[PDB]
């Protein structure tokens, strides 16, 4: 695995039982993200909502399809955050399904 998150929160996912290779190195973590999924020698790759890639096309064009998922939303910090309910719901309705 790898979880791709903030440096300090990336820290807590490198612990045993889990395998992380996080940290920020960009504002969408491109510096890392790209290089890492290119091999696809991690069981799971996950990109948080404290980064999240504004061009998802960038990744798809480089990995060249994947049977394992990518960019699973994790919050990426704690501040009592739970806006990732309604945010993900609308993330869905904008690109697919019905409008508003």
């Amino acid at each position: 695995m790898a979880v791709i998150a903030d440096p300090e929160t990336a820290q807590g996912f490198r612990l045993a039982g889990l395998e992380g290779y996080g940290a920020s190195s960009a504002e969408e973590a491109q510096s890392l993200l790209e290089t890492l999924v290119e091999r696809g020698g991690y069981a799971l790759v996950a990109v948080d909502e404290a980064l999240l890639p504004d061009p998802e096309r960038a990744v798809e064009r480089l990995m060249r399809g994947r049977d394992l998922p990518v960019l699973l939303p994790i919050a990426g910090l704690k501040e009592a955050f739970q806006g990732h309910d309604v945010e993900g719901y609308m993330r869905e309705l904008v690109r697919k399904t019905i409008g508003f």
């Binding site: 807590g12 039982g17 889990l18 069981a43 699973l72 697919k96």
Partner: protein, 105 residues
């Protein structure tokens, strides 16, 4: 929130208790298919799914920080478990993409 609870409260009491915590706990998930991938043929093309369950232990690291160590180990579960939901919906997203596009087409 209950994962992070302990994590973020074990960063300046860790960076030298990082060693201890990783030791007692169950060693890393495999990087080649540590997750359990499932194949499934369904309308909206053949899309594969998966569930994130693997071993990581809980409440079983010996020595170290009284509360935080054990509470951080237990927290690994709240990654695993939680991740299954997004494990099924983001793969469902790619299926319902196919349908929607062919439909309007």
């Amino acid at each position: 929130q209950a994962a992070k609870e302990a994590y973020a409260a074990l960063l300046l009491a860790q960076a030298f208790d990082g060693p201890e915590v990783v030791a007692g706990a169950a060693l890393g998930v495999p990087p080649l298919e540590g997750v359990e991938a499932e194949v499934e043929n369904v309308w909206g093309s053949k899309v594969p799914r998966l569930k994130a369950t693997f071993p990581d232990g809980a409440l079983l690291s010996p020595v170290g920080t009284p509360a935080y160590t054990l509470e951080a180990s237990r927290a690994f579960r709240r990654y695993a478990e939680a991740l299954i939901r997004v494990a099924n919906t983001e793969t469902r997203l790619k299926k319902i993409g196919e349908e929607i596009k062919k439909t309007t087409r």
